[PDB]
Design an enzyme around this catalytic site. Structure first.
Site, mmCIF file in Angstrom:
data_model
loop_
_atom_site.group_PDB
_atom_site.id
_atom_site.type_symbol
_atom_site.label_atom_id
_atom_site.label_comp_id
_atom_site.label_asym_id
_atom_site.label_seq_id
_atom_site.Cartn_x
_atom_site.Cartn_y
_atom_site.Cartn_z
ATOM 1 N N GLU A 1 -14.645 1.072 2.071
ATOM 2 C CA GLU A 1 -14.372 2.418 2.533
ATOM 3 C C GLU A 1 -14.000 3.291 1.351
ATOM 4 O O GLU A 1 -14.793 4.147 0.982
ATOM 5 C CB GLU A 1 -13.308 2.420 3.624
ATOM 6 N N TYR B 1 0.823 -1.217 0.000
ATOM 7 C CA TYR B 1 0.000 0.000 0.000
ATOM 8 C C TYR B 1 0.853 1.261 0.000
ATOM 9 O O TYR B 1 0.685 2.129 -0.855
ATOM 10 C CB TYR B 1 -0.999 0.037 1.161
ATOM 11 N N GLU C 1 -10.482 4.774 -4.484
ATOM 12 C CA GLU C 1 -9.368 3.862 -4.771
ATOM 13 C C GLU C 1 -9.800 2.676 -5.653
ATOM 14 O O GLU C 1 -8.981 2.146 -6.419
ATOM 15 C CB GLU C 1 -8.611 3.411 -3.492
ATOM 16 N N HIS D 1 -4.511 -1.702 -3.515
ATOM 17 C CA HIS D 1 -3.066 -1.815 -3.583
ATOM 18 C C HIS D 1 -2.604 -1.954 -5.036
ATOM 19 O O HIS D 1 -1.860 -1.121 -5.533
ATOM 20 C CB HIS D 1 -2.557 -3.036 -2.789
ATOM 21 N N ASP E 1 -8.478 -5.640 -0.050
ATOM 22 C CA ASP E 1 -8.015 -4.402 -0.680
ATOM 23 C C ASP E 1 -7.084 -4.628 -1.891
ATOM 24 O O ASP E 1 -6.231 -3.782 -2.177
ATOM 25 C CB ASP E 1 -7.345 -3.479 0.380
ATOM 26 N N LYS F 1 1.264 3.862 -3.007
ATOM 27 C CA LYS F 1 1.054 5.306 -2.931
ATOM 28 C C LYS F 1 2.193 6.127 -3.547
ATOM 29 O O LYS F 1 1.951 7.126 -4.246
ATOM 30 C CB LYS F 1 0.833 5.753 -1.480
ATOM 31 N N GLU G 1 0.888 15.862 7.332
ATOM 32 C CA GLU G 1 -0.033 15.841 6.189
ATOM 33 C C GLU G 1 -1.120 16.924 6.287
ATOM 34 O O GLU G 1 -2.131 16.882 5.577
ATOM 35 C CB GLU G 1 -0.687 14.466 6.086
#
Length: 752
Positions: free
Chosen positions: A515, A360, A519, A443, A439, A364, A672
């Site tokens: 969620e 992950y 993505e 990913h 996920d 990113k 962030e």
């Protein structure tokens, strides 16, 4: 041992993991495999289906609570518990200090479906499944109960071996209609159901807590109302048990229309039973119902569920029609930016690094680099663009090989095929990507992004005999076609619910969940770009089908753009996590206010324009978030909010960006506040300025090719196309406009 795929490979033995000195039991437990025990019959062979609304049936001995809307059900030793969330069961709760809201029902039992011969089944297994129904099988030697159910089915079909039917209640139900072998009943709390047995097999126990019937077949229906005409309608299809169910789609490239036909095949349990059923359609389906299916609607047949109102439709099949709106490989060079400033931010991005070794965090980072490369090209910084693409190639050429220099398996940065389930797992893993098969779209979508950007500049690299074969393998893990030898069909996607389910096991009493819908959309976008770059039409169209169907689910269940689904008393203008049985304004980790919105916007990319199709929604959501914050002092991820705000008001987005973007120096993993860590200043600056010149997304115009976008600024339309072909093309838009595009370029705004 390992299997070669062009220049790459994947492991077929579980590697000895290189933990890299880290002792944290959390991180180490992530480097495992999915459960060894799979609760399936010997009729279910090949790669096991995961990421399902029904998956808890396969993973736990019995099941956890499931949401085959309009029912909820759960398997137990005693039998199948059945429940319906009526309005008195539904609640909306807020935790103000946490900043969370929860729309949910209850885990109750209206009644239990039981087998006359045993209340102590050993297990429940998956005996068969199709695109959206499942067949659960409760087993106790000769005693079996086979239960067929699904999302969008107001029937539960029950088949018995070595026994007969029992419906057990805690409080005696009101049997308001007794036709012998068919009964209309209501729970003590006024929930209307019916039960159907073959002719001559009459129900006993009327007036008591236990209703019995000697048949080896019954059906249960949830009725929309206490109404004997509805009962008579439900009686016509109660003996037609669903065996097959298929969602077949076509993409018509000329109009953009994605057409999906949902078709069942049934088996008659009495003489003359029709080949068909009664479907319960979700909003994302019926709002797009084809003209030729309109006559099958049962107008007054409505069920209230977490996702709003379901409606009845009778027959063998129905069809939906959606509009694919195009995607782009990136935004072109059309902004009114200071070009030396954008170049400076591009150079600053060389300080960025991945904040983790897992799929992950590494994903990113390579999404970040893939987004910078075409912007660097546009600014004339071809060396810098090449540096970014080179870094992408080094990372991918590492991860896509399972063996080191000596031919031994590596301990990290590799993919492994788990045979037990049939899935590709990446190590290092995180967020239970390997232990729960979670996920994979989230990913591996970033890996495909990286590869699509390389393919856009270097077709040779993307060939299947080179690095393309391993990229096509990852894609197959998360969205395989039918009859794939290694993987189940469209792993992530639920064709009927219309969305991806992120948990591989679904072992929660709220069913499965998703969620980050953004993505997921990101994953589909990148398969579209990859497949267009590499000339794979079949794969491209499948990703188009998914991008477009998921869009329709997002707009209903995450955004509620039509303002019909969320309860009035629900304060937020978004649902963050959608489950089978509930909706949360909440994140999977402890977060602040922006994150509970922006986790369904990020990352921003050339497929993100779907977010701006409903400008009033975009205003309404932004204004609600702004109200809760109390100002434009965003608690975290400010740039994501600026980018979102530019869909309807780029001046305001520009003003907030100028005030704060340069508070951030160079890359800082620990802060962030301004720049989300998967994002950059360069991307932020390029995006907002582009939107300021282009105006709004215009979804009312389509094109006869798939890589495009149309914008509208006060009635003046900009048309954007990227051409992945070696030859020039001509693109026809649906408003009459026509453009010509040179090879490997945008039509306008290529930069230098």
């Amino acid at each position: 041992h390992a299997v070669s795929v062009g220049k790459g490979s994947y492991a077929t033995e579980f590697p000895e993991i290189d933990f890299g000195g880290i002792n944290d039991p959390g991180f180490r437990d992530q480097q495992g495999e999915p459960p060894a025990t799979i609760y399936r019959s010997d009729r279910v062979t090949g790669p096991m289906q995961t990421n399902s609304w029904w998956g808890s049936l396969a993973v736990d001995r019995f099941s956890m609570n499931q949401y085959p809307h309009p029912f909820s059900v759960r398997h137990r030793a005693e039998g199948l518990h059945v429940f319906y969330d009526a309005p008195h069961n539904m609640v909306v709760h807020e935790n103000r200090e946490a900043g969370t809201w929860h729309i949910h029902g209850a885990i109750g039992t209206d009644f239990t479906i039981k087998h006359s011969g045993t209340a102590n089944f050993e297990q429940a297994v998956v005996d068969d499944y199709n695109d959206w129904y499942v067949r659960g099988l409760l087993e106790n030697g000769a005693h079996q109960m086979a239960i067929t159910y699904g999302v969008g089915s107001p029937y539960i079909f029950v088949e018995y071996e070595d026994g007969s039917a029992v419906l057990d209640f805690d409080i005696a139900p009101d049997v308001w209609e007794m036709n012998g072998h068919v009964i209309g009943f209501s729970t003590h709390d006024h929930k209307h159901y019916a039960a159907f047995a073959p002719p001559g097999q009459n129900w006993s126990g009327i007036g008591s807590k236990t209703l019995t019937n000697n048949a080896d077949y019954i059906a249960i229906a949830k009725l929309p109302e206490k109404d004997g005409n509805m009962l008579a309608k439900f009686e016509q299809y109660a003996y037609s048990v669903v065996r097959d169910a298929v969602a077949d789609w076509t993409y018509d490239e000329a109009t953009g229309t994605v057409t999906t036909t949902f078709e069942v095949t049934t088996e008659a349990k009495v003489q003359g039973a029709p080949d068909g059923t009664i479907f319960a359609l979700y909003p994302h389906q019926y709002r797009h119902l084809a003209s030729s299916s309109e006559n099958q609607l049962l107008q007054n047949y409505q069920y209230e569920i977490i996702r709003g109102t379901m409606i009845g439709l009778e027959g063998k099949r129905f069809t939906t029609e959606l509009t694919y709106p195009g995607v782009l490989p990136s935004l072109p060079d059309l902004g009114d930016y200071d070009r030396e400033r954008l170049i400076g931010y591009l150079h600053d991005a060389t300080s960025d690094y991945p904040t983790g070794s897992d799929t992950y965090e590494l994903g990113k980072y390579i999404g970040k680099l893939a987004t910078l490369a075409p912007i660097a090209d546009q600014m004339g910084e071809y060396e810098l663009a090449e540096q970014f693409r080179g870094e992408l190639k080094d990372i991918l050429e590492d991860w896509l090989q399972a063996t080191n220099a000596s031919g031994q398996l590596k301990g990290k940065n590799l993919f492994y095929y788990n045979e037990n389930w049939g899935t590709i797992l990446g190590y290092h893993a995180a967020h239970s990507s390997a232990t729960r098969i979670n996920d994979h779209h989230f990913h591996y979508g970033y890996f495909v992004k990286a590869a699509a950007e390389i393919a856009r500049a270097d077709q040779e690299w993307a060939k299947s005999e080179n690095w393309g074969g391993m990229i096509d393998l990852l894609i197959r893990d998360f969205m395989a076609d039918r009859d794939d030898d290694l993987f189940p069909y469209l792993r992530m996607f639920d064709p009927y619910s219309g969305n991806s389910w992120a948990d591989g096991l679904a072992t929660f009493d709220a069913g499965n969940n998703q969620e980050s819908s953004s993505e997921a959309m990101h994953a589909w976008t990148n398969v579209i770009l990859w497949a267009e770059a590499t000339g794979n039409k079949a794969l491209r169209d499948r990703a188009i089908y998914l991008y477009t169907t998921e869009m329709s689910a997002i707009n209903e269940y995450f955004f509620d753009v039509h303002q019909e689904i969320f309860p009035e008393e629900y304060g937020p203008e978004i649902v963050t996590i959608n489950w089978g049985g509930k909706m949360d304004h909440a994140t999977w980790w402890n977060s602040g206010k922006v994150e509970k919105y922006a986790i369904n916007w990020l990352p921003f990319h050339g497929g993100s324009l779907y977010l701006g199709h409903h400008p009033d929604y975009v205003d309404r959501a932004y204004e609600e978030l702004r109200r809760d914050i109390g100002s434009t002092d965003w608690n975290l991820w400010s740039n994501l909010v600026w980018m979102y705000r530019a869909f309807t008001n780029p001046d305001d987005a520009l003003q907030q960006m100028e005030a704060s973007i340069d508070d951030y120096g160079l890359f800082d993993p620990g802060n962030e506040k301004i720049i989300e860590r998967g994002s950059t200043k360069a991307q932020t600056y390029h995006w907002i300025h582009n939107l300021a010149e282009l105006g709004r997304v215009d979804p009312t115009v389509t094109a006869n090719h798939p890589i495009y976008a149309v914008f509208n600024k006060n009635g003046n339309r900009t048309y954007i196309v990227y051409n992945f072909s070696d030859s020039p093309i001509t693109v026809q838009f649906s408003d009459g406009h026509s453009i010509q595009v040179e090879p490997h370029s945008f039509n306008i705004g290529n930069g230098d």
